[PDB]
């Protein structure tokens, strides 16, 4: 390590900015999903029974939202394509990148002012927030969108930021649960797509899988489009449980407990 | 670890929170400091020049905040003591947590809304916000603060949070400059403290170091109160440069250029 007091005693490294590479492995934190595709081949669709008015409210937000989206996206009118898959999935990660961020931060500030230990919830919500971004940079590559969709993103994030921000204030049981179902709805989408290839109801023409994604998911150089999905969907299922476990931890007043999943990924 | 479809497919993990241990490592990301004590020994006090109004103004805004906070915290009143110091820093780290955070959280939303690579900023600031939050997490473990101080912290937090937030949106350079110029003082103060220990005016009793500190900073189980202030001094010296470096890039219409520390920390 050549990181020390000489470098710390400097005023700037603006000097050095025109001689440092744009390496696509510096995009993310050194904190990557490590899957294996035979195994994540068998991620299944699930569903969690709603307990109270909150899990119910959550569920209705998330079904009502879908219906509307499916109709304003025109998505289930006529056949499928690769346009509409990528489009839905690009738009939607813009919104997906947020919750974990407004939650991640809230736990941060909440720690700081009460000077209480966070027992590991923050980073997970932060490294989610990154993940779902990373899906969006990946989807950036396969298809760039016209102004129309670039706008809808802005005005939507504007809205979805705020809502989340104040829901996560009031009942971050509402919000951790609300995510839970959004991941359940997604982990469908991404199977239905993995089952579309299989058969031949859709022709992947991006069997050059983006560089960004290759380094991010550590896929071998000959990965297909399906191979992308399967690792996105696995990540999407990780949150499905994690934000349901978190919504459950709230239900029974365990917001101050240790985030199980820091141990459940390192283990004995 | 064993983290595959079978966990992903099991619905919640509420069941397991009574059986997960509370391991001090897990409080923080794995993305920690890694100093060498005699290297960091020669962390030195530096003062970068203001360029424009923005730089000069941000620099006044720190010196006014130091003049205020010192007199009003009675700090300027005779002899250095161990406890008025831990009180000092404890407070300061509860704010030092915030701007690293709003920084990541604002660049992140931009990334998702304009669909663009971040190129390694988001994560470098987010660890800064964690590093300070960890300083805190150590400091609190040296002294519990009283309600009059628990109360000042919770008021501060909002006034700052919403300061940093509107000032970020407005002018990130101003912030980064402001934080550069804040963290200069961070270095002044912690150096001087070690100038009290090496010497005599301070003869501290907390020469146990809390275990949040030792796993986070990788120190021996026989590290001193000097040593701990010295890595913190290091940590703060890291933060000092980066934010002056960031503001500078922002000054030189270079916002979206790769963050140049993702190499200067990594290059093998
Ligand atoms: C809160 C606190 C104060 C101290 O002096 C010391 C420690 C703590 C503390 O809990 O440490 C912070 C731990 C990190 C998480 C931040 C939690 C602090 C805010 C919530 C504490 C109250 C318990 C949740 C009641 P919230 C709730 C949400 C989910 C599950 C259960 C309860 C609620 C319920 C019914 C009616 C109205 C509100 C709620 C209210 C306010 C903000 C967020 N959520
Ligand atoms: Fe997603
Ligand atoms: Fe998702
Ligand atoms: O998704
Ligand atoms: O600080």
Residue numbers in the entry:
A (entry chain A), B (entry chain B): 31 to 298
Reproduce, without paraphrasing, sentences from the article in which this PDB structure was first reported.
The glucose-dependent respiration of bloodstream forms of the parasite Trypanosoma brucei depends on an unusual and essential mitochondrial electron-transport system, consisting of glycerol-3-phosphate dehydrogenase and the trypanosome alternative oxidase (TAO). Clarkson et al. first demonstrated that the respiratory pathway of the T. brucei bloodstream trypomastigotes is solely dependent on a “plant-like alternative oxidase” now known as the trypanosome alternative oxidase (TAO), which is located in the inner mitochondrial membrane of the parasite. The active site of TAO is mapped by the presence of di-iron and a hydroxo ion. The cavity has been described to be a ubiquinol substrate binding site and the oxygen trough.
The crystal structure revealed that each crystal lattice was formed by two dimers (chains A–D) of TAO related by a noncrystallographic 2-fold axis and 1 was bound only in chain A. The molecular interactions utilized in maintaining 1 at the binding site included π-stacking interactions involving rings of the benzoic acid head and neighboring tyrosine (Y144) of TAO, extensive hydrogen bonds, including with T146 and N286, and electrostatic interactions. Of note, strong multiple H-bonds between the pyridine N in the tail portion of 1 (i.e., PDPP cation) with backbone carboxyl groups of V199 and I200 of TAO significantly contributed to stabilizing the binding of 1 to TAO. The amino acid residues that bind the inhibitor are R137, S140, Y144, T146, V199, I200, P202, R203, H280, N286. The binding site for 1 is unique in that it is found far from the active site of TAO, at a distance of approximately 25 Å. Further, 1 was bound at helices 1 and 4 of TAO, which form the membrane anchor of TAO. Figure A shows the active site in the ligand-free form to be in an open conformation, while upon binding of compound 1, the active site of TAO assumes a closed conformation. Superposing the two substructures revealed that the conformational change at the active site was due to the inward flipping of Arg96 side chain into active site cavity 2. In the crystal structure of the rTAO–1 complex reported here, we show a new noncompetitive mode of binding to an allosteric site of TAO for this class of inhibitors; compound 1 binds on the surface of the protein, far from the active site, and promotes a conformational change (i.e., inward flipping of Arg96 side chain) that blocks the entry of the ubiquinol binding site cavity.
